[PDB]
Ligand binder design. Structure first.
Ligand SMILES: [Hg+2]
Ligand SMILES: [Hg+2]
Ligand SMILES: [Mg+2]
Length: 307
């Protein structure tokens, strides 16, 4: 079976999240969504750095055409951070837009660029809860003239995103729904329609909650299972098809991104945050980063945000 390696050099994270593989510099970026920190790992040189801010963060994506600059979330603001990748604080911060200026207890959560470079991201209550809690989030994309457009509401925990290779489908996770949804995606109008369930956890006895996801070159989705101690591989050709399961030692698996020189090593983040209603004892919940090899598939390099 696949080899799952704990990345010792990286330590433990409260809620490690938002992995992004920059293929030209062979570098993994990621965040901690509770500790207000950004992280950089260069596997070939065993180099790790971090950056501290004073707002909650949930994604970090290189800015297309601007080395040393990243598009990030700072609470409810989408911003450009100028960061040399090694100093413990940003050089400067340029706010782009506040997506929800008058919802004081919301935050941005997962974000990713579509294959065209458009940033998509969703919000949630800071005090969201599973299985039941306040449902206050929405799904946005950042469009022309730095204005966002809204595509879906009534989202409890805005999470993983992916797009099909032919640009006809988008896949999206609200963790509270315990399913992955598929949508028809119109790349020319950047609109989504015909929402329907692709994969429903209860139909397949999958525990936990879907969190982050990514898609491989064959069109399979790889989904992180929070409180499931696993990643799952699901079909996009047929609804409700579980293709494979890979166990990850950490129970609270949060997200996934393909990386390595040949885009065939799957990086997996997890959360060490100990929750009061967990299905796993505290001794099991650590928050390591993992690397999975031997899956027999390749993914895609992480896409930069175009502004
Ligand atoms: Hg930073
Ligand atoms: Hg940054
Ligand atoms: Mg997430």
């Amino acid at each position: 079976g696949p080899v799952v390696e704990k990345i010792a050099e990286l330590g433990k994270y409260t809620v490690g999240e938002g992995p992004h593989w920059d293929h030209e510099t062979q570098t993994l970026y990621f965040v901690d969504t509770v500790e207000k920190t950004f992280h950089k790992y260069v596997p070939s040189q065993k180099k790790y750095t971090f950056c501290k801010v004073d707002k909650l963060v949930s994604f970090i994506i290189p800015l297309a055409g601007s080395p040393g600059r990243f598009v990030v979330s700072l609470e409810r603001e989408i911003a450009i951070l100028t960061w040399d990748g090694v100093s413990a604080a940003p050089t400067s911060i340029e706010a782009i837009v506040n997506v929800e200026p008058h919802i004081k207890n919301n935050r941005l959560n997962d974000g990713k660029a579509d294959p065209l470079g458009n940033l998509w991201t969703g919000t949630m209550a800071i005090d969201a809860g599973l299985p039941i809690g306040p449902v206050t989030g929405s799904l946005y994309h950042l469009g022309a003239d730095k204005k966002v457009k809204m595509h879906e509401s009534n989202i409890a925990i805005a999470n993983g995103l992916a797009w099909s290779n032919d640009l006809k489908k988008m896949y999206y996770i609200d963790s509270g729904k315990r399913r992955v949804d598929e949508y028809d995606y119109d790349a020319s109008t950047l609109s989504i329609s015909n929402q329907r369930p692709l994969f429903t956890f209860e139909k397949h006895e999958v525990p936990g909650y879907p969190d982050g996801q990514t898609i491989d070159e064959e069109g399979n989705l790889w989904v992180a299972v929070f409180q499931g101690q696993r990643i799952i591989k699901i079909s996009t050709q047929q609804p409700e098809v579980l293709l494979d399961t890979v166990k990850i030692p950490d129970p609270q698996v949060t997200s996934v991104a393909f990386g390595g020189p040949n885009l065939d090593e799957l990086y997996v983040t997890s959360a060490g945050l100990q929750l009061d209603d967990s299905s796993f004892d505290k001794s099991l919940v650590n928050g390591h980063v993992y690397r999975v090899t031997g899956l027999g598939v390749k993914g895609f390099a992480g896409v930069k945000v175009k502004l």
